[PDB]
Every structure is written in C-alpha cells, then in structure tokens.
Amino acid sequence: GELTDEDVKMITSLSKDQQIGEKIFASIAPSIYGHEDIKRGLALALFGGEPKNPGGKHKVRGDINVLLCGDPGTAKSQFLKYIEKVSSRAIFTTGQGASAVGLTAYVQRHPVSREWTLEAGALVLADRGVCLIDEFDKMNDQDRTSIHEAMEQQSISISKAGIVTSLQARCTVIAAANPIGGRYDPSLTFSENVDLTEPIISRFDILCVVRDTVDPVQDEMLARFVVGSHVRHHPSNKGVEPLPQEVLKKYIIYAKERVHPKLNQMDQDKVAKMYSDLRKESMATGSIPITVRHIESMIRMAEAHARIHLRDYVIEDDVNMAIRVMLESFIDTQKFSVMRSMRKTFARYLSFRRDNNELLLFILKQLVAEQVTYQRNRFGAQQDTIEVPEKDLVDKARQINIHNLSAFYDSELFRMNKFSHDLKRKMILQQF
Amino acid sequence: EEALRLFQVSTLDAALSGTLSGVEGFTSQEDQEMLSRIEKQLKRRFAIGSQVSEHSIIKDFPEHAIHKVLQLMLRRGEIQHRMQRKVLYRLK
Amino acid sequence: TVRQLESMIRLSEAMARMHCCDEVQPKHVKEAFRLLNKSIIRVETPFSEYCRISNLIVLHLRKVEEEEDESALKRSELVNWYLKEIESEIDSEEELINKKRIIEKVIHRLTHYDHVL
Ligand SMILES: Nc1ncnc2c1ncn2[C@@H]1O[C@H](COP(=O)(O)OP(=O)(O)OP(=O)(O)O)[C@@H](O)[C@H]1O
Numbered sequence: 001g002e003l004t005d006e007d008v009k010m011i012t013s014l015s016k017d018q019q020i021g022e023k024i025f026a027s028i029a030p031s032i033y034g035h036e037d038i039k040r041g042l043a044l045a046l047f048g049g050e051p052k053n054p055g056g057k058h059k060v061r062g063d064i065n066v067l068l069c070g071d072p073g074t075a076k077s078q079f080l081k082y083i084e085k086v087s088s089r090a091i092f093t094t095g096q097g098a099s100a101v102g103l104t105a106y107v108q109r110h111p112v113s114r115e116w117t118l119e120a121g122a123l124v125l126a127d128r129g130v131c132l133i134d135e136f137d138k139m140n141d142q143d144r145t146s147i148h149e150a151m152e153q154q155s156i157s158i159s160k161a162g163i164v165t166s167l168q169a170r171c172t173v174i175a176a177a178n179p180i181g182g183r184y185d186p187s188l189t190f191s192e193n194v195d196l197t198e199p200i201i202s203r204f205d206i207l208c209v210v211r212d213t214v215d216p217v218q219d220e221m222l223a224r225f226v227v228g229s230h231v232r233h234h235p236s237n238k239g240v241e242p243l244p245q246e247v248l249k250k251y252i253i254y255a256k257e258r259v260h261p262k263l264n265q266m267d268q269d270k271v272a273k274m275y276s277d278l279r280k281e282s283m284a285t286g287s288i289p290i291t292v293r294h295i296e297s298m299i300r301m302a303e304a305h306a307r308i309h310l311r312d313y314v315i316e317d318d319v320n321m322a323i324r325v326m327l328e329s330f331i332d333t334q335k336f337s338v339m340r341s342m343r344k345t346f347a348r349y350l351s352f353r354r355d356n357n358e359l360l361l362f363i364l365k366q367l368v369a370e371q372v373t374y375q376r377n378r379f380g381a382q383q384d385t386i387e388v389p390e391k392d393l394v395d396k397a398r399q400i401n402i403h404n405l406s407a408f409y410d411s412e413l414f415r416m417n418k419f420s421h422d423l424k425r426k427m428i429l430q431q432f
Numbered sequence: 433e434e435a436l437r438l439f440q441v442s443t444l445d446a447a448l449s450g451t452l453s454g455v456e457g458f459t460s461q462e463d464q465e466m467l468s469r470i471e472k473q474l475k476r477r478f479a480i481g482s483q484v485s486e487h488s489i490i491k492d493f494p495e496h497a498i499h500k501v502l503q504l505m506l507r508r509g510e511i512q513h514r515m516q517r518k519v520l521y522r523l524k
Numbered sequence: 525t526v527r528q529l530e531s532m533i534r535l536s537e538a539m540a541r542m543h544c545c546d547e548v549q550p551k552h553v554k555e556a557f558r559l560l561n562k563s564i565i566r567v568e569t570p571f572s573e574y575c576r577i578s579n580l581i582v583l584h585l586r587k588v589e590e591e592e593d594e595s596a597l598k599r600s601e602l603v604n605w606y607l608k609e610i611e612s613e614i615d616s617e618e619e620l621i622n623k624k625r626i627i628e629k630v631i632h633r634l635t636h637y638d639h640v641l
C-alpha cells in the first residue's frame with residue numbers, strides 16, 4: 001500500500017507551497033461539508049506529535065486524541081469512517097456491540113479458525129495507528145476500563161487464562177460521542193453534558209463540540225451538497241475552500257512521510273506567559289482550569305503542525321496555531337458565560353491566521369441571527385429580506401479593530417453567504 | 433524526626449485542613465450573610481459590594497488569603513456570588 | 525436533522541416509483557415533505573406557554589442587547605423600560621399587570637441569568 005520511492009521529490013515540492021497546511025486541512029473528509037475546525041484537528045491527529053521519554057522514567061505520548069461530541073446527524077460517524085479510509089493501521093470500533101473487534105483483550109478459541117488465540121483488543125491492534133471509537137458514550141464498564149488503561153499507560157494488561165502479559169497499544173484515539181439527552185447544552189460544561197468521566201475526557205488533546213444549529217445559509221449549502229451527492233451516484237451513471245483539495249493518494253503518501261522525526265527549540269516566555277494568563281482567568285472565573293497537560297497537548301499540536309510542513313523545527317507560526325487550536329478546544333468546553341468571557345479576553349491568541357473576512361462574517365451572522373430571533377418571537381415567523389444596519393456592523397468591526405469593511409463587501413465569502421450590500425441606505429441583508 | 437516530618441505533611445490534611453478551613457471560613461461566613469442582607473438592594477441604586485469588599489475587611493481588621501475565598505465563592509454561581517461578578521467586571 | 529433530508533429524498537424517490545416515473549417531479553417532493561412535516565407533532569404543554577416564552581425570548585434579547593452598549597443595570601428602571609419597550613406599539617392595563625407577573629415569575633429563578641436563548 002505504501003512504497004514512497006522517487007515519490008519523495010514531489011512531496012517536498014508541494015511541501016514548498018507555503019500554503020500546504022491549508023491544502024491538507026482542506027483535503028481531509030472531502031465528502032463532509034463544513035466542519036473546518038474538526039478537519040484541522042483531525043489533520044493534526046493524523047500527523048501527530050513527538051513521543052518522548054526523558055531517561056526512561058517520564059513518558060509523554062505524541063499521539064493527539066480527538067473527541068467529537070456533537071448532537072446527532074453532524075457527520076461524526078462519517079469523520080471516523082474517513083479517517084479509517086485514509087490511514088494505515090486504523091481499525092474502527094464502536095461503543096455498542098456492533099463491530100468485528102472490541103476494545104478489550106480476551107483469549108478464546110477463534111470461531112472460524114478454531115485456534116486458541118489471544119484476541120488482543122482494538123486498542124492494541126492499532127498499536128502505531130488509529131483507534132476509531134464510535135458511540136464512545138455507550139461503552140461498558142469494562143470497555144471504559146480498557147480505554148482508560150490504553151489512554152493512560154499506552155498498554156493493555158491481560159491476566160486472563162494463564163496469560164499474564166502487558167502487550168502495548170500506542171494508538172491515537174479518535175472518538176465520537178453523543179451528548180447527554182441528545183442535544184449539546186452550551187450552558188453546561190463539556191464534561192456535564194457528555195456521559196464520560198473526567199479521567200477519560202482529560203486524555204483527549206482536542207475536544208470538538210459539534211453543534212447542530214439552524215442556519216438557513218448553511219442549511220441550503222449542506223442540502224445542496226448532499227442532494228448533489230445523491231444525484232451523481234445514481235446507479236445508472238456509474239468543494240468550497242480557497243485552496244485546491246489534494247488527492248487522497250498523494251495525501252496518504254504525504255502523511256506516510258512521518259519517517260522524519262521532528263524537534264523544537266523555540267519560544268518559552270510567550271508560552272509561559274500565556275499559560276499564566278490562562279490560569280489567572282480560568283481561576284478568576286469559576287471554570288475548568290487550564291493545566292499542564294494543556295500546554296503539553298499544545299506542544300503536540302505544534303509538532304504536528306511542523307510535521308505538516310516537513311519543517312524539522314517548530315516555528316513561531318506552528319506554536320501560534322497550536323495555541324489557537326488548544327485554546328479553541330479549551331474554550332468551547334466551558335459553560336456559556338465563561339466561553340464568552342474567554343472568547344473576549346484571549347481573542348488575540350484565538351484569531352491567529354483567522355483573516356478579517358471570516359471574523360467579520362461571524363460577527364454579521366451573529367447580528368442577523370439576533371435580528372431573526374427578535375423578529376420571529378412576536379411575528380410568528382422570520383420575515384423575508386432580513387436586514388441589518390451598516391452602523392452596528394461597523395461598530396463591532398471597530399471593537400475588534402477592523403475599520404475597513406470594503407473588502408468584506410467585495411469578498412467572495414460575503415457573496416457566497418447570500419449577503420448583499422445596499423449602500424443606498426447603509427443596509428445589508430440576506431435573501432433567506 | 434524525618435519520619436515525623438513526613439507524617440506532619442499529612443497531619444497537614446488530618447488537622448490543618450480544618451484550621452485553614454476555619455481561616456478561610458471566617459471570610460466565607462462573613463460573606464455568606466451580608467451579601468444577601470442587602471440583596472433587596474443588590475439590584476437597587478448600588479449594584480453589589482464591588483471591590484470595596486476586600487477593602488471592607490481591611491479597615492476594621494489579607495488580600496492573598498481573601499481573594500482565594502472570593503474565587504472559591506465565584507467558582508459555582510447561583511444568586512449572589514454569581515450576580516456580584518456578573519456586573520462587577522463589567523462595571524469594574 | 526440532515527437525516528430528515530435523506531428521508532425526504534428517499535420518500536420522493538418512493539413516490540416516483542409508485543407512479544412508475546423515471547424522474548422525481550417536484551410534486552413527488554411536495555408529497556414527501558407534506559408527509560414528513562405532518563409526521564412531526566408539536567409538544568403542547570400547559571399557562572399561555574408559547575406566549576409566555578414568546579415574549580420572554582424578546583425580553584432576554586433586549587436585555588442582552590442593552591448589556592453591551594450601556595452598563596446601567598437596575599431593577600426598577602430596567603423593568604419599567606422593558607415594559608415600555610414591549611409596549612412600543614401596544615397598551616392595556618391587564619397586559620401591563622400580565623407583564624409584571626411574568627417578570628415576577630421569571631426573576632423567581634433567573635434574575636437575568638447567564639443562560640442561552
Ligand atoms: N457536513 C455535513 N454535516 C452533517 N451531515 C452531513 C454532512 N455531510 C454529509 N452529511 C450526512 O449526514 C448524515 C449523518 O450521518 P452520520 O452517521 O455521519 O451522523 P452521526 O454524526 O454519526 O449521527 P449520530 O450522532 O446520530 O450517530 C450522513 O449520512 C452524511 O451523509
């Protein structure tokens with residue numbers, strides 16, 4: 001499946017792109033619309049960080065474990081399926097009983113080969129690969145104990161028949177969970193609307209809170225996406241980003257260029273100050289406190305980002321992007337009040353490589369949704385030609401120091417979201 | 433002696449837990465009632481004891497050992513220790 | 525969810541198969557949507573619900589909006605201003621006392637709390 005011979009020069013060639021990171025983020029799960037942040041986190045997980053063991057007595061993993069917790073029908077199962085396709089040594093398992101391979105090791109006579117075999121579980125069969133666990137919230141007690149041991153010590157301890165062994169499982173765990181009650185509640189913390197204990201949640205570098213909300217524009221976009229899929233795969237006749245997608249073949253080969261390890265000798269005062277500020281905020285506000293493991297996961301994600309660019313040294317942009325990812329994961333997992341406060345105070349960290357067009361689009365969506373809720377609360381339904389003044393958008397763009405909205409109005413992204421600029425009355429409005 | 437010192441650093445939760453529970457609970461119990469006696473006025477002309485509260489105990493009497501209890505109050509948030517800092521950091 | 529969309533296109537294909545058609549006409553889609561939309565029933569619950577909350581949402585919305593631009597947050601000035609704001613094109617005595625009771629009930633267990641919608 002992999003040879004990587006003479007194929008390395010073109011790998012380095014597109015590594016020279018200086019926008020290869022966005023190309024790779026754009027080239028995963030091409031069949032899933034949107035979810036750009038989950039795609040970036042899954043790309044980091046695929047490349048992973050640097051395992052280290054100072055001496056032989058302090059073991060830190062390089063694996064980046066991703067937990068997708070989101071209300072139903074949001075392509076989490078599809079994400080896991082894609083990761084299984086794109087990677088070598090990926091085995092897919094489910095928290096229910098609906099899979100070939102279970103999480104726990106056992107020894108038994110094999111049903112078809114009749115051979116007494118040690119059925120080392122899903123965690124160790126993916127020893128240097130990926131363990132994809134769907135329905136993560138629906139595990140047994142013993143599956144939870146197996147996953148805790150594998151995520152904690154990176155080995156599985158059998159003491160079952162006469163076998164006493166510790167056979168090891170150094171996998172990246174990508175899990176998908178449904179929230180308690182079938183819908184994520186932003187007024188609760190991540191830990192208290194998912195049926196997982198803190199020891200398990202703490203073992204995940206990225207916690208992606210997938211969130212099914214009714215946005216008419218994205219609803220139209222997704223509906224077009226999926227209906228187009230249904231049209232083009234009709235048995236008779238047998239994609240929106242700034243960057244070109246990269247074909248999954250050279251992409252598998254590119255990711256398989258993990259033969260080169262990687263190393264970092266870069267800034268420490270910025271990172272240390274950032275953690276100190278995070279501590280002061282997260283212990284001022286009554287929130288989930290940042291800890292050491294958060295900076296260690298940030299280091300993993302920086303190493304992964306450097307590996308995506310084949311750098312062999314973390315560069316300040318790798319660190320900055322890892323900070324943005326670690327903070328996005330840490331901030332979305334707070335309750336709503338704390339999430340707003342941290343979005344505000346850490347916004348300079350949080351908007352790295354987040355250009356003006358998308359920030360402004362987010363603000364505009366926020367105001368238009370505010371307006372639509374206001375309308376439909378005492379008008380029975382949302383109206384047609386939903387609009388908003390120029391001024392308040394200008395005001396909020398100043399609040400984040402934009403002051404130049406002209407390119408936002410000329411933007412492809414502005415037009416793509418069914419927006420329009422009406423300079424006659426300083427109005428901007430949506431069609432639906 | 434070394435064994436007894438190592439064990440003293442575990443009597444420090446056998447016993448010291450109660451002692452610093454009392455020290456922080458002096459402030460905890462003082463904040464427990466006065467922050468709701470004025471709670472009819474917690475929405476009136478003055479929002480809430482905003483920043484003078486730390487200085488309130490200063491005059492009639494430790495910033496380090498009182499800010500910690502303040503954060504412990506602020507950790508949960510239901511009626512008074514929430515709506516204090518809901519309008520505090522906004523209004524400074 | 526999006527599973528409703530897949531179900532809708534499945535039902536439309538099924539409608540076309542029933543008529544032995546080779547193309548899904550929009551009449552088939554209309555019937556699939558009608559069936560799907562009737563299948564979803566409403567959760568009616570007891571107390572002018574869907575009207576208490578109908579204006580509770582706009583009330584929370586206005587308070588959230590004025591939270592930014594102004595730092596003036598009282599109990600009386602704001603309650604009266606909210607009354608006037610809602611009554612910006614309507615007025616009555618029983619309606620005003622109705623809104624007074626609604627504020628009373630809402631404050632009993634949220635005093636402009638930090639929750640979502
Ligand atoms: N961008 C997208 N967002 C949401 N759903 C999508 C997207 N693209 C495609 N889909 C479709 O949504 C359907 C949802 O199925 P999927 O199993 O991925 O959801 P899920 O997240 O596992 O839901 P559940 O939590 O109920 O298991 C899929 O059939 C997929 O075809």
Ligand SMILES: [Mg+2]
Pocket residue numbers: 076077134135
């Ligand atoms: Mg699923």
